[PDB]
Amino acid sequence: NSIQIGGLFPRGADQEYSAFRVGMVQFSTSEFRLTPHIDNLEVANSFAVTNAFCSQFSRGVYAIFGFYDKKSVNTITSFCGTLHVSFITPSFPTDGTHPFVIQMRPDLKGALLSLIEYYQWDKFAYLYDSDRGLSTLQAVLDSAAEKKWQVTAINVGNINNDDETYRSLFQDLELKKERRVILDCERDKVNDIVDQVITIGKHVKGYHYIIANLGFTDGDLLKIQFGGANVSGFQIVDYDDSLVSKFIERWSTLEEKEYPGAHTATIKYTSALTYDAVQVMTEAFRNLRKQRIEISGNAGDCLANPAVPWGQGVEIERALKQVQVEGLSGNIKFDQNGKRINYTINIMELKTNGPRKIGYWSEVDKMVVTL
Amino acid sequence: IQIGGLFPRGADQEYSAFRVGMVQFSTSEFRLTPHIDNLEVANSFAVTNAFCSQFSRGVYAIFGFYDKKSVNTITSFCGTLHVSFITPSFPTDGTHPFVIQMRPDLKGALLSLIEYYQWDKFAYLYDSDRGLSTLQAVLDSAAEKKWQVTAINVGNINETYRSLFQDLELKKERRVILDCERDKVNDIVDQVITIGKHVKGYHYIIANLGFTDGDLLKIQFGGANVSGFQIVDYDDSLVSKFIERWSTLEEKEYPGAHTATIKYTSALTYDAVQVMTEAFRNLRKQRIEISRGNAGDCLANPAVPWGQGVEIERALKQVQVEGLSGNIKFDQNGKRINYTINIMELKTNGPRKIGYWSEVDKMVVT
């Protein structure tokens, strides 16, 4: 009748949780009910993530949908890989292979290195956070040496008080008259950084910013004041897609009281990846059942040692990774390591009349423009 | 009292060094009861499991190791349950409660060294990872100190070692920093000799704290313009004395315990035993009665009460003793401070201390 799944949600991930439930309803079938048990926790907190996870496993969940960050990812992967429990996640994709983790989020390092070559940049800064990993860094680092680039790669993820040091930033940035900045970092240090360019100095219109994430047109970014600066970014949810359009139809009209974060025209890519994740677990589980593969018994201590992995574990993983569907985030399909493949990333520039889609980037490592 | 002891599999000389010290310090007052585990440190599950089984034993202080992958299991569990962690492992950037970093920090000395040699353009070889914050430190400085840095995370290494040096002749820039594991070093080293002309006009800086510890003279170098770092001075009575017993130990009772020198992490391990000892000796002295075990399941029971944990962490951080790594003193976060790092250059007579970097200031010629 019903399947047990976990939900590990970060403190205050309202919209994502709303999109999750909106998914539970949308792909629900008479066939079976997904029965989630949600924990809200500090994801940066490894202990608390361990506890949340262990709590789920002790309760016999087959699959956990949740989030991690740089500080807790190894906990997720090690425990998932040990107990043979599957984590479906909108969080940043791990470098290197990892069993039992299913990555809803397409990598972006490639589209990005292409965007750089496209604008034929050769001298620029890459101002980074470590918070969604630093595998991207390694990539710009490798190509700079390979494709002969001079790059000023600063981890600006070190902030305190002294905005004396913040003006120091751009102060030094003009040492070579760069003007070309890639921003790979949280939204706060994006606003703060650019705000420094505007307030403290000139010439504002002179810079071109590449915003290194997949939610250019998620509402927040284009709220900041760039001046007349060129501003480029990425988008993974195509609001011109029919599948997306019908979704925002109902979404834009949900009650905000009943569904925190909804009742809006856009949707953050992480919430879109959440919705899609529910379709994905859903399909996986119907593929299992179709093969009459029993979900299923004890599953006690996760710190049980020696540990025993559910026997049905590699099957469920198998089912998840073999899923192929279209979602809010385009073509959804995974390689053997649970990574997104055959996806498209839209390439965006901000213009007087809004974000325009100047092209896209195919996981066949190709950047294609539009007329 | 009862202090856990987590070692990575087959870290023998480190574990033996633990023994030597455990003895050479367990005089008069009390012997510590080390519960030992040999874990796969990269495995955060393993580590969660070791750490917790200690917490069960009622251990107040764990000595041990972590790596890039398990360091957060450690820090999060330590600070949550209020159990002190003493380690020779890489010093985290960023502050963390209930952690005592025995290992001095190398970023500063390195950055000072590069300046000393007036390098403005140079390569960097960053095998992942002894905490790659070093390559960061350098890239954050390159911006200010105007440096052209060709960064190459030699963490992959699948052959293309020849394309590396070869491509680094495009600019004919022949200055290189090697930041990685001992294994990667030797391997990328002999590759400068083969398919590498010229392998002489090159200057190599080895970014670790064991310049002598390992295979230095075990390489022709070619150039062989070489610099690096040692935190252990074998011209130091304290070290010498120690070595005289270390050169004279049975290698079967104590694997890796019979050589003229010793890896800096084993030395750090040794100093940790002394540090942990001086700490409890001082609690007992001031009549603070610690107690007091059988704490249940780390996931379902409460942490050592805060007021007690502090007592011990504070005791560990207040320690100020002379050791193999030199003057050992910690700050409120448990970072080493007021330490000194010897700057080695390679020579024909052998390696020689040419200078020292002081944590109180920067580098100076001897």
XYZ file of C-alpha atoms in Angstrom:
737
model
C 0.000 0.000 0.000
C 2.609 2.573 1.066
C 6.346 3.334 0.813
C 8.435 4.983 3.546
C 10.913 7.684 2.486
C 12.883 10.224 4.460
C 13.046 13.956 3.943
C 16.076 15.789 5.349
C 15.255 19.484 4.992
C 17.498 22.430 5.992
C 16.190 24.990 8.487
C 13.885 27.346 6.589
C 13.848 25.627 3.172
C 10.201 26.660 2.865
C 9.842 26.855 -0.876
C 11.628 23.518 -1.369
C 9.395 21.792 1.104
C 6.326 23.321 -0.593
C 7.514 22.072 -3.963
C 8.082 18.646 -2.341
C 4.501 18.342 -1.151
C 3.204 19.817 -4.400
C 5.077 16.915 -6.002
C 3.709 14.326 -3.557
C 0.261 15.326 -4.782
C 1.092 15.688 -8.454
C 2.654 12.272 -9.029
C 0.558 10.455 -6.462
C -1.070 7.303 -7.762
C -3.785 4.925 -6.644
C -0.988 2.355 -6.918
C 0.897 3.418 -3.780
C 1.409 6.271 -1.337
C 4.834 7.718 -0.600
C 4.996 8.135 3.165
C 7.727 10.691 4.002
C 9.177 11.457 7.396
C 10.623 14.952 7.393
C 13.438 16.258 9.573
C 14.382 19.937 9.698
C 17.981 20.404 10.711
C 21.220 22.343 10.391
C 22.748 20.676 7.350
C 26.178 22.183 7.974
C 26.017 20.266 11.259
C 27.535 16.790 10.756
C 26.379 15.359 14.071
C 22.819 16.542 13.474
C 22.901 15.167 9.977
C 24.166 11.845 11.352
C 21.351 11.822 13.896
C 18.691 12.736 11.322
C 19.897 10.076 8.931
C 20.244 7.383 11.608
C 16.795 8.277 12.842
C 15.427 7.592 9.382
C 17.274 4.364 8.944
C 16.128 3.101 12.341
C 12.590 3.727 11.066
C 13.067 1.608 7.952
C 12.999 4.215 5.165
C 14.054 2.904 1.781
C 15.181 6.228 0.377
C 16.146 9.604 1.798
C 15.489 12.845 -0.011
C 17.499 15.694 1.455
C 20.259 18.276 1.355
C 23.877 18.579 2.413
C 26.636 21.097 2.233
C 30.410 21.001 2.103
C 30.638 20.272 5.831
C 28.211 17.354 5.873
C 28.538 15.710 2.400
C 31.086 13.069 3.541
C 28.686 12.033 6.261
C 25.879 11.501 3.746
C 28.090 9.592 1.291
C 29.898 7.371 3.785
C 26.714 6.371 5.616
C 24.695 6.000 2.387
C 27.444 3.944 0.828
C 27.795 1.784 3.932
C 24.132 1.029 4.677
C 23.173 0.927 1.002
C 20.637 3.691 1.556
C 19.889 6.105 -1.297
C 20.061 9.860 -0.998
C 18.239 11.873 -3.620
C 19.365 15.452 -3.444
C 19.152 18.916 -5.022
C 22.506 19.849 -3.425
C 25.759 20.467 -5.270
C 27.090 17.439 -7.212
C 30.077 15.707 -5.605
C 33.375 15.417 -7.430
C 34.421 11.791 -7.697
C 32.120 8.769 -7.736
C 29.727 7.931 -4.898
C 27.344 4.944 -4.537
C 23.816 5.504 -3.362
C 23.788 9.243 -3.999
C 21.489 10.456 -6.762
C 22.345 13.972 -7.922
C 19.346 15.946 -9.187
C 21.665 18.882 -9.885
C 23.505 19.084 -13.221
C 27.143 19.983 -13.051
C 27.935 23.498 -14.265
C 31.722 23.639 -14.478
C 31.527 22.840 -18.205
C 28.907 25.325 -19.366
C 30.927 27.819 -17.323
C 34.364 27.180 -18.851
C 32.621 27.447 -22.240
C 30.967 30.751 -21.354
C 34.423 32.038 -20.576
C 35.858 30.916 -23.907
C 32.803 32.299 -25.694
C 33.297 35.808 -24.342
C 36.966 35.166 -25.134
C 38.032 36.217 -21.677
C 41.702 35.642 -20.886
C 42.205 37.933 -17.921
C 39.642 38.021 -15.145
C 38.995 37.277 -11.517
C 37.126 34.269 -10.153
C 35.765 35.298 -6.767
C 34.700 32.119 -5.033
C 33.012 30.515 -2.049
C 33.834 26.973 -0.952
C 30.264 26.341 0.100
C 29.121 24.380 -2.953
C 32.513 22.704 -3.104
C 35.596 23.994 -4.905
C 35.779 21.531 -7.755
C 34.914 24.419 -10.029
C 38.034 26.215 -8.876
C 40.181 23.192 -9.851
C 38.554 23.431 -13.282
C 39.257 27.118 -13.894
C 42.707 26.483 -12.466
C 43.383 23.612 -14.858
C 42.113 25.493 -17.906
C 43.934 28.692 -17.043
C 47.222 26.773 -17.121
C 46.111 24.802 -20.162
C 44.350 27.501 -22.188
C 46.800 30.194 -21.071
C 44.700 32.392 -18.776
C 45.757 34.852 -16.111
C 43.298 34.539 -13.243
C 42.876 36.245 -9.942
C 41.249 33.469 -7.895
C 40.326 34.692 -4.471
C 38.290 32.888 -1.859
C 36.206 35.837 -0.680
C 34.406 33.347 1.545
C 36.567 34.852 4.276
C 34.565 37.816 5.574
C 34.303 39.625 8.916
C 34.182 43.354 9.633
C 37.453 45.206 9.054
C 33.864 47.147 4.973
C 37.459 48.398 4.809
C 38.572 44.990 3.561
C 35.733 44.870 1.020
C 36.957 48.041 -0.710
C 40.429 46.580 -0.418
C 39.008 43.860 -2.684
C 38.100 45.958 -5.710
C 40.996 48.289 -4.870
C 43.426 45.460 -5.664
C 41.127 44.181 -8.427
C 41.967 47.251 -10.493
C 45.673 46.419 -10.264
C 45.403 45.076 -13.817
C 42.235 46.919 -14.823
C 40.331 43.635 -14.940
C 36.646 44.584 -15.075
C 35.817 40.904 -15.830
C 34.499 39.125 -12.741
C 33.181 35.611 -12.251
C 31.170 35.267 -9.060
C 31.005 31.712 -7.656
C 29.527 32.321 -4.277
C 26.504 32.794 -2.030
C 23.952 35.446 -2.970
C 24.976 37.647 -0.064
C 28.617 38.044 -1.052
C 27.337 38.629 -4.610
C 25.233 41.597 -3.565
C 27.940 42.826 -1.179
C 30.666 42.498 -3.776
C 28.871 44.235 -6.619
C 27.461 46.801 -4.249
C 31.067 47.737 -3.531
C 31.763 48.310 -7.223
C 28.756 50.611 -7.449
C 29.138 52.622 -4.271
C 32.934 52.630 -4.010
C 34.243 53.716 -7.396
C 33.904 53.534 -11.175
C 33.199 52.861 -13.829
C 30.083 50.910 -12.905
C 28.924 50.164 -16.497
C 32.424 48.911 -17.235
C 32.179 45.479 -15.594
C 30.775 42.217 -16.893
C 29.628 39.784 -14.179
C 29.238 36.067 -14.748
C 27.037 34.676 -11.988
C 28.122 31.042 -11.486
C 24.847 29.286 -10.650
C 21.660 27.862 -12.156
C 19.108 30.380 -10.948
C 19.820 33.569 -12.871
C 16.128 34.200 -13.136
C 15.189 32.876 -9.754
C 13.742 36.143 -8.445
C 16.500 37.348 -6.117
C 19.575 37.943 -8.248
C 18.010 40.302 -10.813
C 16.793 42.344 -7.856
C 20.302 43.702 -7.229
C 21.559 46.911 -8.865
C 24.420 46.160 -11.249
C 24.484 49.596 -12.793
C 24.963 49.397 -16.519
C 27.153 46.372 -16.084
C 26.968 43.456 -18.456
C 25.539 40.547 -16.483
C 25.636 36.887 -17.601
C 24.322 33.693 -15.990
C 22.681 30.278 -16.219
C 19.203 28.825 -16.061
C 18.132 25.206 -15.898
C 14.389 25.671 -15.656
C 12.913 26.978 -18.882
C 9.840 29.039 -18.140
C 9.041 28.868 -21.860
C 8.664 25.088 -21.644
C 5.065 23.830 -21.649
C 5.743 21.481 -18.744
C 7.001 24.391 -16.663
C 4.250 26.769 -17.775
C 1.442 24.475 -16.614
C 3.271 24.062 -13.339
C 3.603 27.742 -12.525
C -0.068 28.018 -13.457
C -1.105 26.049 -10.378
C 1.955 27.061 -8.359
C 1.442 30.798 -8.883
C -2.060 30.343 -7.503
C -1.361 28.185 -4.458
C -2.184 29.685 -1.052
C 0.944 31.193 0.582
C -0.416 30.247 4.000
C -0.833 26.649 2.935
C 2.360 26.500 0.862
C 5.185 28.780 2.085
C 7.307 30.084 -0.771
C 4.720 29.387 -3.455
C 2.169 31.747 -5.031
C 4.941 33.183 -7.186
C 5.941 33.471 -10.849
C 9.314 31.812 -10.490
C 10.729 29.013 -8.424
C 14.288 28.553 -7.261
C 16.097 25.802 -9.099
C 16.533 23.892 -5.840
C 12.735 23.770 -5.406
C 12.335 22.734 -9.045
C 14.927 19.983 -8.413
C 12.906 18.947 -5.372
C 9.663 18.539 -7.300
C 11.530 16.594 -9.964
C 13.111 14.348 -7.303
C 9.648 13.226 -6.219
C 8.749 12.268 -9.768
C 12.054 10.408 -9.882
C 11.576 8.435 -6.676
C 8.015 7.781 -7.826
C 9.101 6.288 -11.155
C 11.905 4.259 -9.585
C 9.459 2.775 -7.162
C 6.947 1.793 -9.824
C 9.706 0.096 -11.776
C 10.559 -1.939 -8.747
C 6.917 -2.880 -8.082
C 6.468 -3.684 -11.770
C 9.205 -6.248 -11.248
C 7.482 -7.264 -7.991
C 10.664 -6.540 -6.101
C 9.712 -6.461 -2.446
C 10.703 -3.256 -0.671
C 10.560 -4.949 2.757
C 13.437 -6.896 8.308
C 15.054 -5.274 11.361
C 17.242 -2.259 10.490
C 18.244 -1.177 13.980
C 21.450 0.611 14.934
C 23.039 2.462 12.054
C 26.168 2.375 14.148
C 25.650 -1.385 14.293
C 29.045 -2.966 13.749
C 29.574 -4.990 11.752
C 26.926 -3.186 9.704
C 24.353 -4.952 7.513
C 23.182 -3.276 4.245
C 19.585 -3.921 3.200
C 19.647 -6.556 0.494
C 17.090 -4.614 -1.471
C 19.466 -1.611 -1.369
C 21.368 -1.965 -4.689
C 18.093 -2.627 -6.408
C 16.446 0.592 -5.351
C 19.609 2.450 -6.305
C 19.499 0.642 -9.637
C 15.906 1.707 -10.108
C 16.606 5.348 -9.305
C 19.606 5.636 -11.603
C 17.697 3.956 -14.476
C 14.863 6.471 -14.344
C 14.478 8.831 -17.298
C 11.855 11.615 -17.391
C 11.251 15.254 -18.268
C 10.842 17.634 -15.367
C 10.868 21.296 -14.491
C 14.635 20.951 -15.061
C 14.515 19.460 -18.560
C 15.695 15.999 -19.481
C 16.351 14.001 -16.305
C 18.681 11.029 -16.651
C 21.660 9.645 -14.701
C 24.965 7.878 -15.336
C 26.067 4.891 -13.223
C 27.360 7.238 -10.555
C 23.982 8.989 -10.178
C 25.133 12.148 -12.011
C 22.832 14.143 -14.365
C 23.513 13.472 -18.042
C 21.949 14.635 -21.330
C 20.865 17.915 -19.801
C 20.865 21.413 -21.184
C 21.816 24.610 -19.406
C 20.378 27.851 -20.750
C 22.775 30.745 -21.009
C 21.425 34.056 -19.907
C 22.341 37.678 -20.206
C 20.587 40.544 -18.512
C 19.332 43.191 -20.979
C 17.198 46.384 -20.751
C 14.084 44.307 -21.236
C 14.908 41.437 -18.908
C 16.941 38.204 -19.007
C 17.379 37.004 -22.593
C 18.374 33.484 -23.549
C 21.375 33.907 -25.827
C 22.003 30.181 -26.089
C 22.402 26.877 -24.334
C 25.070 24.365 -23.341
C 24.763 20.689 -23.969
C 26.308 18.108 -21.732
C 28.003 17.027 -25.011
C 30.239 19.903 -23.944
C 28.809 22.230 -26.600
C 27.797 25.877 -26.330
C 25.225 26.799 -28.969
C 23.948 30.369 -29.627
C 20.507 31.637 -30.770
C 19.256 34.073 -33.445
C 42.547 8.600 32.926
C 40.685 6.927 30.045
C 41.553 8.619 26.796
C 40.655 7.054 23.474
C 43.276 6.640 20.776
C 42.270 6.551 17.114
C 44.945 5.627 14.553
C 44.745 5.198 10.772
C 45.470 1.629 9.597
C 49.185 0.802 9.806
C 50.371 4.215 10.982
C 53.007 2.273 12.878
C 55.802 4.706 13.658
C 53.115 7.135 14.842
C 51.535 4.492 17.050
C 54.894 3.295 18.405
C 55.877 6.895 19.136
C 52.699 7.086 21.187
C 53.968 4.148 23.259
C 57.464 5.549 23.823
C 55.940 8.745 25.168
C 53.152 7.069 27.114
C 56.017 5.489 29.027
C 58.525 8.280 29.098
C 55.896 10.419 30.799
C 53.766 8.107 32.988
C 55.755 8.823 36.148
C 54.535 9.196 39.723
C 51.020 10.561 39.277
C 48.973 8.235 37.055
C 48.976 6.139 33.905
C 46.420 7.031 31.221
C 44.143 4.241 29.953
C 44.281 4.522 26.138
C 41.536 2.636 24.339
C 42.942 1.970 20.859
C 41.176 1.694 17.506
C 42.759 1.206 14.079
C 40.265 2.775 11.709
C 40.048 3.718 8.073
C 40.177 7.462 8.636
C 38.715 8.452 5.272
C 35.492 6.675 6.239
C 33.225 9.100 8.097
C 31.023 6.188 9.094
C 34.058 4.392 10.527
C 35.054 7.567 12.303
C 31.576 8.328 13.610
C 31.701 4.738 14.894
C 35.112 4.901 16.569
C 34.491 8.293 18.110
C 31.143 7.231 19.493
C 32.310 3.926 20.980
C 34.888 5.990 22.849
C 32.197 8.387 24.055
C 30.498 5.245 25.400
C 33.631 4.180 27.311
C 33.320 7.528 29.049
C 36.582 8.794 27.561
C 37.050 12.556 28.224
C 39.845 13.103 25.673
C 40.385 11.396 22.343
C 43.794 11.533 20.709
C 43.724 10.653 17.038
C 43.853 11.586 13.379
C 41.381 12.746 10.724
C 41.558 13.630 7.080
C 39.888 15.980 4.601
C 36.907 13.609 4.435
C 36.475 12.877 8.173
C 37.533 16.210 9.701
C 33.919 17.429 9.978
C 32.696 14.261 11.614
C 35.380 15.007 14.207
C 34.843 18.725 14.720
C 31.048 18.327 14.779
C 31.068 15.372 17.206
C 33.783 16.910 19.413
C 31.988 20.191 19.842
C 28.575 18.646 20.262
C 29.447 16.036 22.875
C 32.185 18.200 24.458
C 34.956 15.595 24.148
C 38.470 16.944 23.589
C 40.279 15.952 20.421
C 44.071 15.994 20.214
C 45.583 15.441 16.756
C 48.841 15.614 14.672
C 46.693 16.010 11.603
C 46.488 19.060 9.378
C 45.423 22.228 11.295
C 41.959 23.364 10.187
C 41.459 26.832 9.001
C 38.649 28.278 11.030
C 38.137 27.973 14.760
C 36.740 24.848 16.408
C 35.895 23.970 20.094
C 37.410 20.911 21.762
C 40.154 20.602 19.201
C 43.840 20.732 20.011
C 45.903 21.054 16.813
C 49.387 19.723 17.623
C 50.500 20.579 14.082
C 51.987 24.041 13.492
C 50.602 25.960 10.516
C 52.656 26.142 7.319
C 50.840 28.732 5.155
C 52.614 31.695 6.697
C 56.132 30.269 6.473
C 55.583 29.229 2.878
C 54.223 32.606 1.820
C 57.219 34.189 3.605
C 59.588 31.789 1.849
C 58.305 32.583 -1.640
C 58.875 36.259 -0.891
C 62.356 35.524 0.491
C 63.329 34.008 -2.857
C 61.644 36.910 -4.641
C 59.481 34.616 -6.742
C 56.897 36.494 -8.807
C 56.200 33.690 -11.305
C 56.149 30.020 -10.375
C 54.188 26.784 -10.539
C 52.204 25.084 -7.807
C 51.487 21.381 -7.462
C 48.518 20.764 -5.194
C 47.676 17.091 -4.666
C 44.324 16.789 -2.871
C 44.550 17.119 -0.039
C 46.297 18.054 3.208
C 43.676 20.782 3.318
C 44.200 22.734 0.092
C 43.803 25.977 2.035
C 47.503 26.426 1.279
C 47.042 26.802 -2.475
C 44.232 29.182 -1.452
C 46.486 31.183 0.855
C 48.822 31.559 -2.110
C 46.165 32.555 -4.625
C 44.793 35.099 -2.190
C 48.309 36.501 -1.898
C 49.233 36.279 -5.564
C 46.618 38.974 -6.096
C 48.284 41.416 -3.664
C 51.971 40.467 -3.939
C 51.594 40.407 -7.724
C 52.432 36.793 -8.606
C 51.826 34.850 -11.817
C 50.871 31.416 -10.528
C 50.326 28.378 -12.707
C 48.179 26.153 -10.477
C 48.099 22.405 -11.172
C 46.280 20.081 -8.768
C 48.519 17.047 -9.265
C 45.795 15.062 -7.515
C 44.689 13.162 -10.612
C 47.955 11.844 -12.087
C 46.652 9.258 -14.575
C 51.732 9.703 -17.756
C 50.879 13.376 -18.364
C 53.690 14.217 -15.926
C 55.768 14.775 -19.060
C 53.212 17.196 -20.509
C 53.364 19.135 -17.239
C 57.040 20.077 -17.173
C 56.996 20.266 -20.976
C 54.160 22.807 -20.975
C 55.861 24.707 -18.123
C 58.702 25.394 -20.542
C 56.374 27.466 -22.695
C 57.105 30.387 -20.402
C 60.374 28.750 -19.410
C 59.299 29.474 -15.844
C 61.266 26.934 -13.807
C 60.196 27.622 -10.188
C 57.903 25.085 -8.533
C 56.145 24.404 -5.236
C 55.287 20.788 -4.464
C 52.289 20.369 -2.161
C 51.236 16.753 -1.808
C 51.762 13.302 -0.316
C 55.225 11.737 0.039
C 54.377 9.265 -2.701
C 53.356 11.887 -5.270
C 56.549 13.826 -4.577
C 59.130 11.125 -5.316
C 57.114 10.215 -8.429
C 56.874 13.725 -9.893
C 60.524 14.141 -8.892
C 62.243 11.443 -10.959
C 60.104 12.667 -13.872
C 62.132 15.892 -13.964
C 65.235 13.833 -14.719
C 63.632 11.776 -17.488
C 62.238 13.560 -20.554
C 63.322 16.741 -18.794
C 66.045 19.003 -20.132
C 67.078 20.949 -18.491
C 66.218 19.646 -15.023
C 68.825 21.876 -13.401
C 67.965 25.566 -13.612
C 64.856 24.703 -11.620
C 64.033 25.675 -8.040
C 61.789 23.362 -6.035
C 60.087 24.103 -2.749
C 58.629 21.162 -0.888
C 55.655 22.406 1.130
C 55.588 20.049 4.097
C 57.012 19.789 7.606
C 59.198 16.729 7.035
C 61.903 17.866 4.619
C 64.397 15.475 6.283
C 61.717 12.977 7.302
C 61.477 10.596 4.353
C 63.362 10.513 1.061
C 65.413 13.666 0.573
C 68.901 12.362 -0.219
C 66.926 9.626 -1.981
C 66.784 11.830 -5.072
C 69.391 13.275 -7.438
C 67.269 16.424 -7.809
C 69.364 17.349 -10.836
C 69.418 21.096 -10.304
C 69.071 20.474 -7.639
C 67.923 23.819 -6.237
C 65.726 22.599 -3.360
C 64.075 24.231 -0.314
C 61.668 22.984 2.358
C 60.649 22.898 5.997
C 61.566 21.049 9.182
C 59.857 21.540 12.539
C 62.304 19.081 14.171
C 65.906 20.170 14.841
C 68.294 17.258 15.329
C 70.772 19.750 16.757
C 68.479 19.970 19.769
C 69.493 18.186 22.967
C 65.894 17.180 23.669
C 65.599 15.620 20.221
C 69.085 14.057 20.392
C 68.461 12.420 23.750
C 65.171 11.078 22.422
C 66.822 9.858 19.230
C 69.494 8.051 21.228
C 66.733 5.863 22.693
C 64.893 5.897 19.359
C 67.972 4.716 17.505
C 68.240 1.995 20.158
C 64.783 0.384 20.203
C 63.662 -3.109 19.124
C 61.848 -2.817 15.772
C 59.642 -5.856 16.549
C 58.194 -4.559 19.804
C 57.884 -1.105 18.268
C 57.524 -1.027 14.456
C 59.414 1.857 12.864
C 61.370 2.482 16.075
C 65.036 2.304 15.049
C 66.298 5.101 12.823
C 68.463 8.216 13.041
C 65.443 10.399 12.220
C 61.657 10.418 12.540
C 58.585 11.670 10.630
C 57.199 14.918 11.973
C 53.758 13.460 12.646
C 55.249 10.735 14.845
C 57.144 13.453 16.644
C 53.827 15.378 16.923
C 52.233 12.228 18.222
C 54.975 11.901 20.798
C 54.527 15.513 21.909
C 50.782 14.930 22.178
C 51.329 12.326 24.897
C 53.351 14.813 26.865
C 50.763 17.520 26.284
C 47.855 15.358 27.461
C 49.872 14.374 30.504
C 50.894 17.849 31.607
C 47.216 18.750 31.291
C 45.741 16.247 33.754
C 48.702 16.579 36.089
C 47.606 20.218 36.378
C 43.933 19.457 36.973
C 44.762 17.037 39.791
C 47.166 19.590 41.281
C 44.520 22.329 41.540
C 42.190 19.832 43.251
C 39.583 19.657 40.468
C 37.943 16.258 40.881
C 37.003 14.989 37.416
C 34.125 12.515 37.231
C 32.473 9.196 35.845
C 31.758 6.995 32.809
C 29.147 4.793 31.087
C 27.732 7.591 28.915
C 25.240 5.853 26.657
C 24.654 6.303 22.943
C 26.217 9.400 21.411
C 23.122 9.849 19.307
C 20.610 9.419 22.126
C 22.411 10.536 25.291
C 23.700 13.882 26.525
C 27.151 15.334 26.032
C 29.642 15.521 28.837
C 28.278 18.538 30.637
C 29.845 21.677 29.249
C 31.432 22.941 32.481
C 33.427 19.713 32.730
C 34.578 19.462 29.115
C 35.860 23.058 29.243
C 37.904 22.171 32.294
C 39.943 19.729 30.255
C 40.125 21.591 26.921
C 41.275 24.638 28.837
C 43.880 22.497 30.589
C 45.116 21.233 27.247
C 45.250 24.735 25.763
C 47.025 26.252 28.795
C 49.875 23.760 28.417
C 53.285 25.318 27.690
C 56.022 22.693 27.406
C 59.221 22.107 25.467
C 59.077 19.194 22.999
C 60.362 17.479 19.873
C 58.544 19.965 17.641
C 59.935 22.772 19.789
C 58.096 25.209 22.001
C 54.501 24.042 22.265
C 51.872 26.607 23.229
C 48.252 26.929 22.122
C 45.802 29.729 21.696
C 42.157 29.850 22.750
C 41.211 27.742 19.696
C 43.947 25.185 20.192
C 46.216 26.387 17.375
C 49.953 26.127 17.990
C 51.540 29.559 18.613
C 55.035 30.952 19.328
C 56.536 28.112 17.314
C 59.428 28.270 14.842
C 59.925 26.577 11.457
C 63.338 25.778 10.085
C 63.894 26.616 6.422
C 65.942 23.974 4.666
C 67.848 24.247 1.429
C 69.385 21.205 -0.239
C 73.165 21.044 -0.523
C 75.945 18.715 -1.699
C 77.082 18.105 1.885
C 73.404 17.407 2.522
C 70.441 19.521 3.697
C 71.141 22.471 5.976
C 69.111 24.817 8.155
C 69.576 28.167 6.479
C 66.921 30.054 8.409
C 63.838 29.990 10.595
C 60.360 31.416 10.391
C 58.921 32.614 13.642
C 55.248 32.534 14.366
C 55.841 35.741 16.274
C 57.127 37.410 13.024
C 58.503 35.993 9.644
C 61.680 34.490 7.922
C 65.339 35.256 8.842
C 68.778 34.237 7.518
C 71.073 32.347 9.905
